[PDB]
Amino acid sequence: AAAAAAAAAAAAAAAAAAAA
Amino acid sequence: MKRTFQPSVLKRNRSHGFRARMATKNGRQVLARRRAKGRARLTVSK
Amino acid sequence: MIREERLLKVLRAPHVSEKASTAMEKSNTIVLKVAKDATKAEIKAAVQKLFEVEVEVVNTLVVKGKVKRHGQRIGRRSDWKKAYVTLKEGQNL
Amino acid sequence: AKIRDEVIVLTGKDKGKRGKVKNVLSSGKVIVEGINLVKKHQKPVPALNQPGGIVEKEAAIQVSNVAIFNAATGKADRVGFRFEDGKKVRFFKSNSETI
Amino acid sequence: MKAKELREKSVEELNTELLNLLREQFNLRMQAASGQLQQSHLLKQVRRDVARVKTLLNEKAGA
Amino acid sequence: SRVCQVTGKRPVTGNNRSHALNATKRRFLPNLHSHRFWVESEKRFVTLRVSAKGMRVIDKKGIDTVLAELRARGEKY
RNA sequence: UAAGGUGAUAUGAACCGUUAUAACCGGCGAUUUCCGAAUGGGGAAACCCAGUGUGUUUCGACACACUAUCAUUAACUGAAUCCAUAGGUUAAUGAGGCGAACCGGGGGAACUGAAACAUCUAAGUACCCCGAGGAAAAGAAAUCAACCGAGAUUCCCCCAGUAGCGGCGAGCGAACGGGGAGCAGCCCAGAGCCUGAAUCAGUGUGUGUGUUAGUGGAAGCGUCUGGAAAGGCGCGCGAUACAGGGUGACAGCCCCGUACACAAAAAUGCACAUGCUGUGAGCUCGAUGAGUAGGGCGGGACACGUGGUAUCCUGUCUGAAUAUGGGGGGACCAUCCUCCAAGGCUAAAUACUCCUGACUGACCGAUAGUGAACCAGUACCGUGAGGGAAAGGCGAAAAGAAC
RNA sequence: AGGACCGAACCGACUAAUGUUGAAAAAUUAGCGGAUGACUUGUGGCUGGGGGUGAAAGGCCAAUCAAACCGGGAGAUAGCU
RNA sequence: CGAAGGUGUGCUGUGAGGCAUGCUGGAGGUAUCAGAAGUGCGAAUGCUGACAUAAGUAACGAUAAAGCGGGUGAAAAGCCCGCUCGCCGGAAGACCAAGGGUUCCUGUCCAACGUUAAUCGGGGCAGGGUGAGUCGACCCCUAAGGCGAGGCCGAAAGGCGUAGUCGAUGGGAAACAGGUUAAUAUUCCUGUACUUGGUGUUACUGCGAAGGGGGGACGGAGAAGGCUAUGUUGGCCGGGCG
RNA sequence: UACGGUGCUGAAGCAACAAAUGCCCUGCUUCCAGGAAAAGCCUCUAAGCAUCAGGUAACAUCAAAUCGUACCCCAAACCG
């Protein structure tokens, strides 16, 4: 009955802005 | 690919050492902190 | 004395448990749990005085334990030394 | 402490019933015999612990559920120990028996 | 024992104590340590007697 | 260090204040010069690093009197 | 202190002791590996190596002690250079480092506020460092007052958001005086006179009281419901104790305690007893702190930003008098009043709380409270510095469910 | 002989494709370039944040970089949501 | 002779809600009036924790294919054994560093853990196991560099650095090959040595330094020769004739 | 033999040829960029020592400690 669970915070962005 | 963490006990010990943080006021305050803070893994060295 | 009874205190217990020390008991030599104290010479002078088994070298070897019991806090054994006594002519007596 | 004892026991189920008090235990328990009775389910296992039966085992009862037998009375009338003979010597206080 | 040891003179206790330890505790400490007789109670004492001998004599300053 | 050794003046500190009043720490250091004074009562040189208010004191109070001091006061003769 | 134990998860085995030297608890002592200020040298924290003595020695080897550095002192030697220092060696002392906070000194912001923002503010805070003590520092007027007088310092509440300062913006913000808390003054800069004489200090040794062990310490039964009574009902009793907790449901009289009354081998806190040790007093007459105070220059501290701006601190350059004299009383002079710096020390009142004990709480009750009631500064996460959880409860009793 | 040529190792990343809640917080496959040097890499060592380093891009300095990270000022401040 | 809370209903009040009560529950809770609050929650991409949802969907980690027959076991596509088949082979093999830190081997057990099944395993639980004069690290010696007595600087902290002393990745004395453990191995054993040091015995003799000199002691590229590991072939020997 | 395998025994065991990036060779040649150090080693003396002691050689004899060493090691034990 061990437990280990973290939280994640890293980006899912890769896509670039529209119409600058 | 080449990652961050490549260990080397030789370097760790002689760049994050107990006996390498033992000679300056500031590298003394460090010890002081993790002991009255109770933190007791130290430098992680045998 | 040639050296203190402090170092005639090293032997605390016999280890001859199982193979390679049963194999090597039948074949030759004895083996015995020796402290942790770290020498050869005071050990060589130990199995002589204490006992009277004749020896000629000692082989010394740290026994570094392994992780063990409880998932409620994972533990590891205290270390010691095993020494192969290395009987000279003591294997007959 | 005033209890190696002639009790009659305060608690019900046990109320006028007697026994020796074998040993006084550290955790505020004692052993009274014939009246702490539990029906301990002995499990049988090798190299002793051989019989398989729901055995009876005097468990251990509290030490404030004891009340003390007296010679002339079933009840207790409390114990003073205060008489000096070179140590505390007991007595049921309020007739100071020397017991 | 306690006072037994306490009334013994310096020179005495010195040769007694090699004995206590070795070959009056040594014999126990090996046998027991491999199980031959589980007279386990014997270690506790002796140890706590070989302590005594080393307390005294030194602490008596050679008396 | 930058002590007079006659009176031992440490550098005071304080703010500049400009013709539009702009404070900024800047350090007021004594003068300090190594001068070889002549004991004449041991007849040797006692090069001491001393200021130039300091020097005036040594001449006015007398050689073997500041040399009395310093040694009595805990800093190197 | 005591009839029962062998700390805990955790049982159990073997045994020990049974009121009188077990076992339990305290004082004192001993031991206190190795690392760590760590210190014989070295070093990747918990390791490696060595010198010199005192030995032992079965002649093989193996112990034990000392050996750091720095400050001071003493002795010994002793260059360049006769000399002498300088230096070096040695020895005897004392120090070093670790702490949470408070305190004094040294150093010292920025965000922010000013609706921006630079003077100002934040704040001389935070923070770093150094130093020390149980309090610290400060302190026996070159302090005020106002034509009367007051008389060391400190701290509290005022005075009073006054007076005043102020990109007169924001804001900062006293004192004088008043009431209290709490109160002791003294040396040296020198000759005496008597010559431990007060007085402290440190050594004694004791007397008292306190603490660190603890001990004793009161008075209820019947009955009904109930798994169980400590609840209900009925009849009693103790009270310098009805504080609390525990015991099978809510117990003054069931138990541990409790007030109260006792109790110390020793070791120490506190008063006082008095020896010694050192300290220096008490009367005469002298003394009254120069590279200083002022002053020029530049800053800082004063509520006060140089502004009309004293005064105090002082880095720079000068540079005065010597009690028929000097300082100050907020530009400055005069007068008048009042005081004697540049030598030094000092209790208390007051601040603070890591830690210790005892108690208490309209504080919490397990997403709370500390992060943390449970093997928590842990597990984990990070190279590190560091960051940093979850997870409490069967039951009255393990009787933890034989078969 | 050669910062020579062709090209494994080794290093590096020019194209495309596949991936792109992946097999993987930058890789894989087929091609590609360099290749005894201004090479490349192991071991160890050295530069510190207003600073380094930089055949130079504001790149890189622990998956973070036009001023790292961590603690603290600090519950900064936010007329803003 | 059944509190709170939970969970249902009736009644009731303008409402917030209250009251009565059945079931659950096994103990505490509190009229009234007044006093105080961490005093009322649906929303903060709130926070923590629980459990959904997409869904039994996606995927199941290489296009280096496995197949059979036994064995055990309750259960075999995957495991063990055996026989084929395929794959790598300057590695997907072997030795070793770094790093890890028992993951090794043996015996047992399958909840959880392997992205399945699981009799299996680097899992759990027991046990066992790492052996050196010569190997390597300590060690001797130093390198870049570091720390640094004295010292000079610097408010302090500290900074630098001399004499020193550390610091490998270099240099320094020396063991090889069989045989052997369930698992070790240049270490144990066996065979055959070598190295250095101490002491002593003997002989002989000018020995002696934080000292002097020499020697240690060295680049890149290229170019052969000489040589051997080793390989190929034949010979030899053994076995074989489909 | 238990069917995991263990013991008992043992023939031949040569030659030629090809070789390596390995060794001789940290050499040699050559080239311009001009290519560690210290100690051990050997040797000379200084202060010093004097039938000594030390040095050198042999022989006899003894000592040579402590840790790592398992296993993985292009990986399923390392890093992600």
Q: How far is residue D1's CA from residue D26's CA, in Å, rounded to a whole number?
A: 12
Q: Sketch out chain C's domains with CATH numbers.
A: 1-93 (3.30.70.330)
**C7 Cβ under 8 Å from any chain E Cβ:** no
E3: which 2 tokens? 């006072």
Whether E22 and C14 lie within 8 Å, measured CB to CB: no
Q: Which domain holds residue D36?
A: 1-99
Closest CA to C83 of C27, C48, C40: C40
Domain count for chain D, please give it.
1
Strands D6-7 and D19-24, bridge-based pairing: antiparallel
Contacts 24+ apart (CB under 8 A), E47-55: E49/E1, E49/E20, E50/E17, E50/E20, E50/E21, E50/E25, E52/E1, E52/E2, E52/E5, E53/E5, E53/E13, E53/E16, E53/E17, E53/E20, E54/E17
Give the amino acid at C72. Answer: Q
Residues of E in contact with C6 (CB under 8 A): none
Q: What is d(CA E21, CA E28) in angstroms, rounded to the nearest whole number?
A: 10
Give the whole-angstrom CA distance, residue D10 versus residue B14: 72
Name the residue among C8, C12, C50 with its Cβ closest to that of E33. C12
- Residue C79, Cα to own-chain centre: how many angstroms? 13
Q: What is the DSSP letter of F49?
A: E
F43: left (phi over 0), alpha (psi -120 to 50) or beta: left
Cα separation of the two ends of chain E: 17
Name every chain C residue with its beta carbon within 8 A of the beta carbon of E18. 5
Structural biology method used: cryo-EM
Separation CA D24–CA D41 (nearest Å) = 24
Residue-wise over F37-75: b if at least 16 C-beta within 10 A, else e? Answer: beeeeeeeeeebebbeebbebbeeeebeebbeebeeeee
Residue D18 CA and nucleotide I233 C1' are separated, in Å, by 108
Instruction: Say how far apart CA B43 and CA B18 lie, in whole Å.
Output: 6
Residue type (1 letter), C25: E
Nearest residue (CA) to C1' of G388: B39
Chain E interface with C: residues with Cβ < 8 Å: 18, 21-22, 26, 29-30, 33-34
Q: Which domains does chain F have, with CATH numbers?
A: 1-77 (2.30.170.40)
Q: Which domains does chain B have, with CATH numbers?
A: 1-46 (1.10.287.3980)
Chain D 12-31 residues whose Cβ is under 7 Å from strand G: 12-13, 15, 23-26, 28-29
